[PDB]
Structures are given as structure tokens and as C-alpha cells.
């Protein structure tokens, strides 16, 4: 943020940005509020 | 009273391991530092030709 109008707030692409790997890194977790994911639709059939 | 620990002081070295993850860069342990995590080194084979 330059003069804090600047550098708002950074959403997530909706193509790819929630990656599957990533996530929280260390055992004694924080267990944070706003949690994000990925899911299919419900026309792709279920396999394991 | 239902517990009773003895606290004592100890002369913790590691000699042959480093650290593969640690949360910041600084001393003075506090709960973050309660997860962090080592790993071994690699071998070396010092030895006559």
C-alpha cells in the first residue's frame, strides 16, 4: 500500500489460486477463522 | 496437590542434527517455537586414498 488506497486486499483467482498443497505448516496449529478449499461439482462422478 | 515436577538444568547440545523448519528468526523460545522441527545431516567419509 503506497498511501494505504493503494495495495487493497488481494483475492484468489478463481482458476487455481487455493492450492490443494498448501495449507498450515507446524503442528501446534493457530486454527485460524477464514478457511478456504477446493470441490467438485456434482456432475463428475465419485471414484476414490 | 495432585502433581509434582522437578525442574532442572541441562546441558542440550545437538551434535549432529539441524533444523529444517524455524518459525522466526530469533532466540528467546515462546510458544510458537513449541512445533519447530530437525533433521540429520548428511555423511561424510573421511578416509585414507
Same mark, same amino acid.
Given at each position: 500500500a503506497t498511501v494505504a488506497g493503494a495495495g487493497?486486499?488481494? $483475492?484468489?483467482?478463481?482458476? $487455481?489460486?487455493?492450492?490443494?498443497?498448501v495449507g498450515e505448516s507446524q503442528w501446534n496449529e493457530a486454527d485460524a477463522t477464514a478457511a478456504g478449499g477446493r470441490v467438485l461439482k456434482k456432475t463428475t462422478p465419485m471414484k476414490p | 496437590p495432585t502433581v509434582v515436577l522437578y525442574s532442572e538444568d541441562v546441558n542440550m547440545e545437538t551434535p549432529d542434527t539441524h533444523?529444517?523448519?524455524?518459525?522466526? +528468526?530469533?532466540?528467546?523460545?515462546?510458544?510458537?517455537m513449541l512445533g519447530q522441527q530437525? +533433521?540429520?545431516?548428511?555423511?561424510?567419509?573421511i578416509a585414507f586414498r
Amino acid at each position: 500500500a503506497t498511501v494505504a488506497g493503494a495495495g487493497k486486499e488481494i $483475492f484468489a483467482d478463481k482458476t $487455481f489460486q487455493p492450492e490443494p498443497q498448501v495449507g498450515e505448516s507446524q503442528w501446534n496449529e493457530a486454527d485460524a477463522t477464514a478457511a478456504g478449499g477446493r470441490v467438485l461439482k456434482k456432475t463428475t462422478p465419485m471414484k476414490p | 496437590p495432585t502433581v509434582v515436577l522437578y525442574s532442572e538444568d541441562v546441558n542440550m547440545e545437538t551434535p549432529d542434527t539441524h533444523l529444517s523448519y524455524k518459525p522466526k +528468526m530469533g532466540d528467546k523460545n515462546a510458544k510458537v517455537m513449541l512445533g519447530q522441527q530437525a +533433521m540429520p545431516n548428511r555423511p561424510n567419509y573421511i578416509a585414507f586414498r
